[PDB]
Design a protein around this ligand. Sequence first.
Ligand SMILES: CC(C)CCC[C@@H](C)[C@H]1CC[C@H]2[C@@H]3CC=C4C[C@@H](O)CC[C@]4(C)[C@H]3CC[C@]12C
Ligand SMILES: CC(C)CCC[C@@H](C)[C@H]1CC[C@H]2[C@@H]3CC=C4C[C@@H](O)CC[C@]4(C)[C@H]3CC[C@]12C
Ligand SMILES: CC(C)CCC[C@@H](C)[C@H]1CC[C@H]2[C@@H]3CC=C4C[C@@H](O)CC[C@]4(C)[C@H]3CC[C@]12C
Ligand SMILES: CC(C)CCC[C@@H](C)[C@H]1CC[C@H]2[C@@H]3CC=C4C[C@@H](O)CC[C@]4(C)[C@H]3CC[C@]12C
Ligand SMILES: CC(C)CCC[C@@H](C)[C@H]1CC[C@H]2[C@@H]3CC=C4C[C@@H](O)CC[C@]4(C)[C@H]3CC[C@]12C
Ligand SMILES: [Ca+2]
Length: 1274
Amino acid sequence: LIDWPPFEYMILATIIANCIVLALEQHLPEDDKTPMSRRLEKTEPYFIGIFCFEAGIKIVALGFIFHKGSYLRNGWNVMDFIVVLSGILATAGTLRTLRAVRVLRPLKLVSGIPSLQIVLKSIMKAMVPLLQIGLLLFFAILMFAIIGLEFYSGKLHRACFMNNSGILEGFDPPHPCGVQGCPAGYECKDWIGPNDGITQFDNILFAVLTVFQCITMEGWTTVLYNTNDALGATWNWLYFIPLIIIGSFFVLNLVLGVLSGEFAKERERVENRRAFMKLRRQQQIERELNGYRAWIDKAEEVMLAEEIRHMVKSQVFYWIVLSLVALNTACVAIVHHNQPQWLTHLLYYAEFLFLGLFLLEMSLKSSFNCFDFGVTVGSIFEVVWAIFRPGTSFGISVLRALRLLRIFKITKYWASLRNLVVSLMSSMKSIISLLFLLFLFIVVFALLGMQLFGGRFNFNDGTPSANFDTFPAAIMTVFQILTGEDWNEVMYNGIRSQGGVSSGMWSAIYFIVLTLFGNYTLLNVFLAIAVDNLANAQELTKDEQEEEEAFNQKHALQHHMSVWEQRTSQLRKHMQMIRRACHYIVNLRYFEMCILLVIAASSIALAAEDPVLTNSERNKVLRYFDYVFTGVFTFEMVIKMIDQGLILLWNILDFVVVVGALVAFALANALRDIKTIKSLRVLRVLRPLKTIKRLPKLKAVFDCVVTSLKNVFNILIVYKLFMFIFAVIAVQLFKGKFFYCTDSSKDTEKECIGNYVDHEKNKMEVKGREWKRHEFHYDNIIWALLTLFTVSTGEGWPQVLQHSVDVTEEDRGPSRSNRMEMSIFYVVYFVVFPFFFVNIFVALIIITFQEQGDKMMEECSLEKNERACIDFAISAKPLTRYMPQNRHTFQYRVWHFVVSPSFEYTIMAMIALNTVVLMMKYYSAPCTYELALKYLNIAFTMVFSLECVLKVIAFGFLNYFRDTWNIFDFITVIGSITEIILTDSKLVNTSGFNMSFLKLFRAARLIKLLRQGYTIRILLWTFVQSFKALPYVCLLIAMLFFIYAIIGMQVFGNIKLDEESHINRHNNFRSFFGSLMLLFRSATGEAWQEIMLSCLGEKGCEPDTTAPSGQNENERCGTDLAYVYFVSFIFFCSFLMLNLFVAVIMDNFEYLTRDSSILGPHHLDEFVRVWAEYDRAACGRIHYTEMYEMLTLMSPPLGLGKRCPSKVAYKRLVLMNMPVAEDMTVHFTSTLMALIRTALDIKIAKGGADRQQLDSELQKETLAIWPHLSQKML
Ligand SMILES: CC(C)CCC[C@@H](C)[C@H]1CC[C@H]2[C@@H]3CC=C4C[C@@H](O)CC[C@]4(C)[C@H]3CC[C@]12C
Ligand SMILES: CC(C)CCC[C@@H](C)[C@H]1CC[C@H]2[C@@H]3CC=C4C[C@@H](O)CC[C@]4(C)[C@H]3CC[C@]12C
Ligand SMILES: CC(C)CCC[C@@H](C)[C@H]1CC[C@H]2[C@@H]3CC=C4C[C@@H](O)CC[C@]4(C)[C@H]3CC[C@]12C
Ligand SMILES: CC(C)CCC[C@@H](C)[C@H]1CC[C@H]2[C@@H]3CC=C4C[C@@H](O)CC[C@]4(C)[C@H]3CC[C@]12C
Ligand SMILES: CC(C)CCC[C@@H](C)[C@H]1CC[C@H]2[C@@H]3CC=C4C[C@@H](O)CC[C@]4(C)[C@H]3CC[C@]12C
Ligand SMILES: [Ca+2]
């Protein structure tokens, strides 16, 4: 059957049918079957027989034994054979090898369509460079887990329980006990664990799982608070804050940098260049053809005039039909719940009027029409459908608001947007294939989850909304886990369904793999799409706006590039191969400095303040300091106004700060309405912002941030328009439907009145009936926008999805899982905004990042990366490893046992065994086991101690310290010796201060094996080195954190701490550090919307101990300005984070795009080690014997590739200005610069006649480098 014209199509149809059958299965607990599932069970033998037939046709009629082109030698066919063979065994039992393996059946579509094979191959190829990053992740997870094992092991097993109510009860977020006891009539008692004994550091596996959950920023604050009340809140913050900073933010930065570098490198491949050239020529032909079409119409209009639809090409008509769209846009954006009765009638007539008018507009007739026709026909279908079945109206006329994007034509930003759309439309098959492949993998994971946890989530308190029972529910749960929101809560259910923490922990692997390969594969795919489609648009725009300049300069006849642009252009060309004394007093040298000190002092004073106790000694002294601060601030500016003459800028905020402070005690000391005083005193939080103008580097980074915002604003407009469209559609879907009664029995507001018995937590209670609304809803467009923003941030969106699914009708209480098709809206929203637009913003910031340090046009004008390499030649001192000089019986004899391969390998084995021992501890270990662990540490610390004292014998006491790593080893071993001495000696002990930190010195031996990792070490060092080159972006982020913390403390600092809310003893604005921790928690996005709601409205106020008054409560505190305060913080911080990451990525863009074929900075180490090894001591001289054999042993990618080009290579040495005129001259730097010129920027060999101008250019380009280069040239 070697000819299969449609055989493959029929097999594909069979696979599709099998996928559909697998999608209709429903899983029930305790061996229960739906009658539909029993019928579906009958279809399996047919599929098994068909697949057996197709396998037999390819085994014995294509080849199985002949190894060349056999059936099983293909990787994509062994999977098919495994699936068919395991399916056969399932019918032989008439379960893991029987039914749990048929979830790979959808993966047979990938092998069926080789296009999907190519797409998957590209996906995998793009993800290879991330592997090393993954290694750097695992070590980090290994590093902190061990630290968590030595401190938190077994410390989370007691909790406050005693309530004289049945040896039970306690707070819903249970309060673990510690070294201080319960605060009240509670007593410490044995506790299973925080998440039913799952979130803990008992052994290394639990610690690793907890650390992995924390680095994903999912519930890490709960872990932090569990150890805050179990061991005190003094040092726990020192473990979790770095863990998020290193494990989560740093890894994300590294992943983004590596991915962007790989995308830039791979955009210059031959096939990609050919495709882009094809697209460019298509666009150029279209551009030239469009202009000629104007001639045909203009001529045709004239002849008919001198012997038709000329009004539809005029500005007036194009503006009227665009203002009518704007009028329609506002018409649909005013619909809201409980709208006035006349407004409904007016809008009902307006929709008909607008539909008729737009039909009339169409009657008088790019793809503008191709989209307008679709919008209008959809509107007709929607209005016709609504009339036949009244009650529901999704709303599609709002899609015609997309025509408002045509207003960009009058601007100068139309070319870039049109190019972006053109590039996206050209590369649409690839995008569709990528989305389909992601859908296929999601389907496979949903089926696997249905097998593992299907029909197992109905516990005693009810089944969760995120279950794997039906296919829609399983796919929703898998999507939620992929987005990484509340995945730990699903993992907890998946563990306690397989047998609890005892024997169900193996089910965590599913969620770990899903989280990893959804967090990073999704980012890879979508960032690749965004980068490859935005760089193409940038190149098209630059080639379209530069061919008109050249043409215009020819019509008369007859380097602000970003780092990305420069690097990508260079990568391509290298691939083919009275006012008299006031002026004096303000112009003093030591004047601005004292202003900085006073501003910093005022900021620190703002930091130290109690918002609850208004009238205290500290607050009084702080106000007294504020008096002199505002006096000096008035004095700093009155001398400038009588100097610069007021207005004949940036210091407007300084003026408002100075003025508002005077009014602050003008009204306070005027003598009722004390609230205006507090509201006016929040102004002084702009005091830190006064340092931006004074510091020039801070001003530079602020200007860079502003320019980035200006660059992104154009796409921000489109993002806002799409968000508005979605919000308008979301209103028509869930307007007024987010209401519920406190008891599930009642459905409307009429019944929801009175009292009812509540049977929660196995306890009865009489509670009033309240007709409440969900906290986040879609009642109007502002609430819809806020809800969609919170969903886009990714916080609490599963709860909003559940509320939307429970939606039933206009004014009725929810019905569980009533409308499950409402999850289409959220899936589409997630695919569009957080998956595509955010990556568009990131890519646009990446590819349009202007260099900040240089800010110069012609720094070298020939290259950019070799400037460091050019200056590296004079800085490449042969730093030796300090070999012994004595060569005697004492120093040398022991030295041969240091460089010997027995010693180093033995030390590596000892390090590996020590790391194995470190993770061998667990809670409730036998006493003999702990004793063995203790004595094992003693053995290892002697070997490392002996190694430390054996190095100093050979290298030298003042010589062994010359290396950073040897200092680290000495400090580690000294700390370990101190630790073992202090806690083992019978009489040398302590009873007071706790020296428990010394355990870190024992756990800091992991970094030793970091010496083995070469590329990991280089990458880490490069990123760390480029982190300290920009110490003012971090300063800007710190300033934003400080300002927002001060604002929150001054505004939300007096809210009463209440449990069951998110402003409690753990999370509040009471102190500066508490507010800073709250802001960090919100930045990581834990429950920031819950905090925003809990600091919103008329919350009860903290009792003020001081300031006596004649009332009891006066007024409630807590503003309604919380919304802005959080919505502005989630944006700003995020932006300020992104502008940081790119600032680190573009600083190392030379490393991230290495192109290891003509590498020059990475090759310097090889030449350095060769020169060091050949001459034991440099002595400032080079012999005339080893040069002629240098190119042979030196790496092939430079100098010498083979014997055929060896003649050319040698001709690149002779017949020019040779240094061998004097045989005792320099022969290293000469051939180095010869190689550098030959490898890059060949400009002298071709000419070979003029050399003085090149020497002058080299001398003038390196004037301030201590110019001893007079002999380097020779
Ligand atoms: C000089 C300014 C600008 C910088 C330093 C400001 C801070 C550190 C100073 C200024 C005023 C000070 C307070 C003044 C009065 C009291 C009351 C008493 O219980 C002693 C400590 C306490 C609570 C001080 C703590 C430290 C404090 C808050
Ligand atoms: C793969 C990711 C991107 C999700 C893709 C969306 C598809 C596969 C999912 C998401 C929402 C799902 C729908 C949600 C609810 C319902 C209502 C139910 O009575 C029939 C099935 C149906 C109609 C589901 C079919 C599958 C579905 C359309
Ligand atoms: C270019 C952009 C603006 C296109 C946006 C398309 C979005 C808004 C459309 C495309 C698919 C649509 C969904 C398709 C199906 C359903 C099920 C129906 O019972 C309620 C509406 C709902 C849930 C639609 C809501 C709106 C929707 C998500
Ligand atoms: C040789 C090393 C590197 C293997 C990897 C270490 C892991 C898999 C080993 C090392 C020590 C082991 C622990 C030793 C003893 C017990 C006590 C038992 O009641 C529960 C399991 C538990 C807590 C083990 C879990 C697995 C464990 C943590
Ligand atoms: C160099 C390191 C990595 C080697 C680790 C292996 C040794 C030290 C470990 C592995 C197996 C362990 C033993 C396993 C079982 C028992 C029996 C128990 O009743 C007391 C502890 C005791 C006796 C353990 C002591 C430590 C032990 C011998
Ligand atoms: Ca979250």
